Amino acid sequence: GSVHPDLRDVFSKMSFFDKIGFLFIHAFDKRNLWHKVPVPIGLLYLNTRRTLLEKYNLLAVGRSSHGALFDPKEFLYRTEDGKYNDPHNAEAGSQNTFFGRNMEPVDQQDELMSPDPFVVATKLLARREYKDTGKQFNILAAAWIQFMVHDWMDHMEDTGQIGITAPKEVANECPLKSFKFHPTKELPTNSDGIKIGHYNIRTAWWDGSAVYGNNEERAEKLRTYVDGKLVIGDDGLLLHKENGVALSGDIRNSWAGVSILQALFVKEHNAVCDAIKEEHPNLSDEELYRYAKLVTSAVIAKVHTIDWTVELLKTKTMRAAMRANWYGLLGKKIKDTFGHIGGPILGGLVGLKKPNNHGVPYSLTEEFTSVYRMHSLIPSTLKLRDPTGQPDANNSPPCLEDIDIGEMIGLKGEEQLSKIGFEKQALSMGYQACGALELWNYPSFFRNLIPQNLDGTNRSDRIDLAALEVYRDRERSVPRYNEFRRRLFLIPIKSWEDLTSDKDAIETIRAIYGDDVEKLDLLVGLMAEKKIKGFAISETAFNIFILMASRRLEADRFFTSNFNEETYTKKGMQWVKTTEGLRDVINRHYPEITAKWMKSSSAFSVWDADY
Ligand code: HEM
Ligand SMILES: CCCCCCCCCCO[C@@H]1O[C@H](CO)[C@@H](O[C@H]2O[C@H](CO)[C@@H](O)[C@H](O)[C@H]2O)[C@H](O)[C@H]1O
Ligand SMILES: [Ca+2]
Ligand SMILES: [Cl-]
Ligand SMILES: [Cl-]
Ligand SMILES: [Cl-]
Numbered sequence: 001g002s003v004h005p006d007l008r009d010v011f012s013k014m015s016f017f018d019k020i021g022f023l024f025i026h027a028f029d030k031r032n033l034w035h036k037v038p039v040p041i042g043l044l045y046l047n048t049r050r051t052l053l054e055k056y057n058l059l060a061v062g063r064s065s066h067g068a069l070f071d072p073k074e075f076l077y078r079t080e081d082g083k084y085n086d087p088h089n090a091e092a093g094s095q096n097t098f099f100g101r102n103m104e105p106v107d108q109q110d111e112l113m114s115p116d117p118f119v120v121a122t123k124l125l126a127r128r129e130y131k132d133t134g135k136q137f138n139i140l141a142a143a144w145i146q147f148m149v150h151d152w153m154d155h156m157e158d159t160g161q162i163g164i165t166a167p168k169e170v171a172n173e174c175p176l177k178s179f180k181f182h183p184t185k186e187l188p189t190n191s192d193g194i195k196i197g198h199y200n201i202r203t204a205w206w207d208g209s210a211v212y213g214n215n216e217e218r219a220e221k222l223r224t225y226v227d228g229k230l231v232i233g234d235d236g237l238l239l240h241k242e243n244g245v246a247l248s249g250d251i252r253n254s255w256a257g258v259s260i261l262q263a264l265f266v267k268e269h270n271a272v273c274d275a276i277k278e279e280h281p282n283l284s285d286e287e288l289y290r291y292a293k294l295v296t297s298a299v300i301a302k303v304h305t306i307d308w309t310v311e312l313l314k315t316k317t318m319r320a321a322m323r324a325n326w327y328g329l330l331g332k333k334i335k336d337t338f339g340h341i342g343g344p345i346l347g348g349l350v351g352l353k354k355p356n357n358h359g360v361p362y363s364l365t366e367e368f369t370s371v372y373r374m375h376s377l378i379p380s381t382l383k384l385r386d387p388t389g390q391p392d393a394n395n396s397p398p399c400l401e402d403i404d405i406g407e408m409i410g411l412k413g414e415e416q417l418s419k420i421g422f423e424k425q426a427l428s429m430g431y432q433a434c435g436a437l438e439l440w441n442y443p444s445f446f447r448n449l450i451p452q453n454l455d456g457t458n459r460s461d462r463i464d465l466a467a468l469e470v471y472r473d474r475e476r477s478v479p480r481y482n483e484f485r486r487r488l489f490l491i492p493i494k495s496w497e498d499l500t501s502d503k504d505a506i507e508t509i510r511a512i513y514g515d516d517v518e519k520l521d522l523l524v525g526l527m528a529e530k531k532i533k534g535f536a537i538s539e540t541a542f543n544i545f546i547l548m549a550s551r552r553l554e555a556d557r558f559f560t561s562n563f564n565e566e567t568y569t570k571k572g573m574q575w576v577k578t579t580e581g582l583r584d585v586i587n588r589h590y591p592e593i594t595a596k597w598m599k600s601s602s603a604f605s606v607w608d609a610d611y
């Protein structure tokens with residue numbers, strides 16, 4: 001028996017060339033070796049795994065043929081709703097389009113409540129001893145990833161409501177004894193393959209929509225209509241409407257941490273507007289907006305790719321891998337001087353002569369949503385520090401007060417932030433570790449949370465988010481943990497002890513799920529899975545990232561065929577090329593806290609990290 005019994009069927013159907021790739025990665029996987037080898041072999045492994053996933057784990061939802069026809073040269077900018085990127089598909093990546101899938105759906109209609117979402121939430125997710133990431137990853141990094149989800153994906157809801165009630169066995173430990181919510185909207189695909197789909201009400205393109213808006217009706221509200229600029233308050237914080245809702249791109253179900261990143265990137269955009277106007281004085285407001293949006297959205301993609309992900313996956317192999325996606329294996333020096341050389345590996349995904357969607361129209365997917373459910377990253381309390389205080393017993397800015405992060409959330413949080421200010425919020429977030437993605441680390445304020453409508457206003461029905469998330473994965477027919485692994489050519493668990501060596505986790509899991517490893521929910525598995533050294537996430541989630549993070553760059557005209565001076569302006573392109581991370585953005589606008597307190601290379605590391 002060479003191949004794992006559960007992957008023999010798919011192996012036997014593979015082409016000769018896919019068989020070779022499978023056997024290569026599987027040789028490492030059977031011995032858990034890919035991340036224990038030197039960088040060059042690790043990269044070969046990752047590229048081989050990626051190619052396999054691109055072939056087997058991109059599934060269209062909704063008819064792929066047709067699509068409105070247009071001239072790409074009449075759309076050399078990022079449209080407000082994300083349309084007109086893909087020359088062969090004007091709708092691809094735009095607002096209100098189907099989520100794709102990475103795997104065939106698994107119907108769970110008869111087990112939507114098995115085991116009970118409140119039991120799962122209470123016994124497995126609810127924060128006990130707080131666990132953080134040490135120096136590796138800070139609260140800016142937790143905020144960053146939510147800021148990105150607001151740039152990426154949100155499921156259209158059904159107008160009706162349903163409700164669930166905590167069973168007597170755990171009701172006493174539940175902050176809410178029941179709650180209502182809207183089911184995920186189901187739309188018929190009218191297609192041969194998958195029959196039911198869900199809509200993404202955000203643009204799937206990496207287009208800065210968290211700052212710019214998800215369509216034209218939204219985007220117009222945020223612009224000054226002078227020099228291409230966006231509105232911002234004199235304190236350097238977002239403006240607010242009279243109902244308390246923030247004036248930015250996507251402000252739904254947010255907190256203060258996201259609000260400061262949005263405000264920071266408003267200033268980034270406006271500073272790009274200044275720089276470009278300087279080189280091209282006769283540009284209109286509209287032209288300046290378009291160029292600055294291209295630059296700023298590219299800056300965001302870049303920061304996420306070669307800074308955030310690099311600190312999230314803190315290994316030599318992943319630094320090399322992520323930099324290779326952006327700059328190419330030939331490296332930054334060659335890329336910057338001589339442009340893109342060779343194919344996707346040597347020159348990188350960015351600056352490819354043509355976009356490549358690998359035969360399947362661009363979309364974000366149901367499973368991409370699932371693996372990005374990282375609410376346990378939010379700490380329980382924020383230690384506020386003094387930007388001009390005397391350095392304490394360490395060389396840290398001194399602590400002024402602990403504040404409960406539940407007070408920093410939603411409309412109330414916008415009010416609290418208006419009293420704290422940017423520098424204090426940012427510095428304090430920089431100097432504190434975020435939470436680890438482990439069992440028993442889901443914040444209690446999420447279990448008693450006020451959700452918001454599309455317009456940012458509060459809903460009167462609070463939710464238990466831990467419980468809801470477990471419900472959403474089942475509701476949307478995402479395979480449960482073990483099958484999820486199988487579909488990605490990963491070795492499934494046979495017993496609980498294959499998942500984790502923590503005895504209490506094993507015992508708690510057994511009492512809820514029995515010994516049926518097929519019943520284990522995805523979210524529970526992703527949090528519980530024993531982690532690769534340096535990895536803040538599970539290997540399982542990482543596999544979706546391998547595929548989809550590449551896809552977000554490779555499928556986009558504006559990171560590929562139109563990643564050039566003609567589309568971005570010369571100054572615009574130079575701005576992207578000379579920005580390497582969030583540090584560079586924070587330094588541009590807030591050089592004094594950066595000089596005084598940012599000691600780490602990356603602004604995503606706890607700011608006194610020694611590297
Ligand atoms: C204060 C912090 C946060 C709040 C208040 C918040 C709130 C929410 C709410 C209300 C939902 C909708 C649940 C539903 O109706 O199904 C949601 C979904 C989600 N959140 Fe958060 N969240 C926070 C932080 C984060 C962070 C740090 C991440 C990191 C990746 C994240 C990722 C997601 C994802 C992936 C979804 C599912 C979205 C979808 O269905 O398309 N959130 N969040
Ligand atoms: C310089 C090097 C020269 C290169 C020569 C390469 C020749 C082989 C390339 C494709 O390999 C074949 O691909 C088929 C799939 O397209 C496989 O069918 C397999 O899978 C099919 C299902 O996909 C089943 O119908 C078949 O029974 C099953 O054998 C078949 O096994 C495999 O050998
Ligand atoms: Ca977007
Ligand atoms: Cl490099
Ligand atoms: Cl190449
Ligand atoms: Cl990613």
Ligand SMILES: [Cl-]
Pocket residue numbers: 576577578
């Ligand atoms: Cl660059």
Ligand code: NA
Pocket residue numbers: 497498499
């Ligand atoms: Na194992």
Ligand code: NA
Pocket residue numbers: 601611
């Ligand atoms: Na350095």
